[PDB]
């Protein structure tokens, strides 16, 4: 019963950052050495936890959040960050305990005509709370006049698409991101290391 990190990291299709995907890890042994012994990651930033020191540790639950952004925005998947992604798409708490794993996916998420399936939220009337997921497509009212679900003057559709073409420079090519988060409650633990 090894934990299904494979069906999260090698999922053929990922998800847009505004509708980020969460996988609940439960009732399994997690061999995190497969993660940090891999030579195919660009970034492996862990916060408040040591990935090399938890294969003899147990947790009540582990969450695997996966989505796609661009290289300029990978630095925003971290506690205490601001920007389009951190404020309107995916926010991490200041006391975040987990890892942010990212790798370039230009060979997978780019098309010659430009990949326009991956979206991100451009406007929102307020910042996201940590681990909040907004999928609404309501028209953003930027001015005094109120829109009636119609797009127009000072009335924007809230989702814009990434322009992932294979010829984009580093930072505008897509990156797939997996965010592992760990919680420990006063409840039984189901995710342990092999030790």
């Amino acid at each position, epitope marked *: 019963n090894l934990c299904p990190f494979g069906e999260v990291f090698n999922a053929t299709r990922f998800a847009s950052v505004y509708a980020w995907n969460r996988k609940r890890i439960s009732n399994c042994v997690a061999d995190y050495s497969v993660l940090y012994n891999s030579a195919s990651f660009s970034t492996f930033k862990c916060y408040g*936890v040591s990935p090399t020191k938890l294969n003899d540790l147990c947790f009540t639950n582990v969450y695997a959040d996966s989505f796609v952004i661009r290289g300029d925005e990978v630095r925003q998947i971290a506690p205490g960050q601001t920007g389009k992604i951190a404020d309107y798409n995916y926010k991490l708490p200041d006391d975040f*305990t987990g890892c942010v794993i990212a790798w370039n996916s230009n060979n997978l998420d780019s098309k010659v005509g430009g990949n326009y399936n991956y979206l991100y939220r451009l406007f929102r009337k307020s910042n996201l709370k940590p681990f909040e997921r907004d999928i609404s497509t309501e028209i953003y009212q930027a001015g005094s006049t109120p829109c009636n679900g119609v797009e127009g003057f000072n009335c924007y559709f809230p989702l814009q698409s990434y322009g992932f073409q294979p010829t984009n420079g580093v930072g505008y090519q897509p990156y797939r991101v997996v965010v592992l988060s760990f919680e420990l409650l006063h409840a039984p633990a189901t995710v342990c290391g092999p030790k």
Partner: antibody
Amino acid sequence: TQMQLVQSGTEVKKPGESLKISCKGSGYGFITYWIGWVRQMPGKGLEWMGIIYPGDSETRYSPSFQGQVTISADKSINTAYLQWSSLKASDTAIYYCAGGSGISTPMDVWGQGTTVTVAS
Amino acid sequence: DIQLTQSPDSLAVSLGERATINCKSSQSVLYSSINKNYLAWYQQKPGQPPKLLIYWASTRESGVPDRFSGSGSGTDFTLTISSLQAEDVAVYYCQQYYSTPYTFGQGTKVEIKR
């Protein structure tokens, strides 16, 4: 061992000269490690200078060392650097590099230190 | 910015007795997600790099004798060397790794009481 940090040799420099000391991590899983620099003046305690994540070169400094030193890294050779542009006599100390997989994690691996001497 | 103050600065304890070192933080270091305090204890000897003894306030690092134990919560933490031995004579620092900048205590010297 999960990680070992080897450090450059002892340095005898003159006041005003520049200096760059290194700290190379030897082991697998270095992608997850953050390397910090600790200064220990002769007969004094431990001062945390800064830390750097070599994967993207995110660098945080202590307010006592902000702008006084430059902590760089070369992720292609698992090496982190600590350099001065103009050495003062008050820079004579031993400099330990310390590593730990993750940030806000204990520094659980240390090098044997690099002793720097800025002196006629 | 978190500041740590150790006490006492010097400590003399007879062979086989209990040595206790206190560490006070100007701010809490408790992560709510995993109920753990982000406080560590280090030992240093002359000509040697610091050795990690205890992390998460009360968890023993590998290669540390059973007689080393940590405790505390909030802002008061304690390193306890029960049955003090000869090679335990060293300087002991408490470090917080709750947030950057990392900070150390001023150091506590522990000697055998002849």
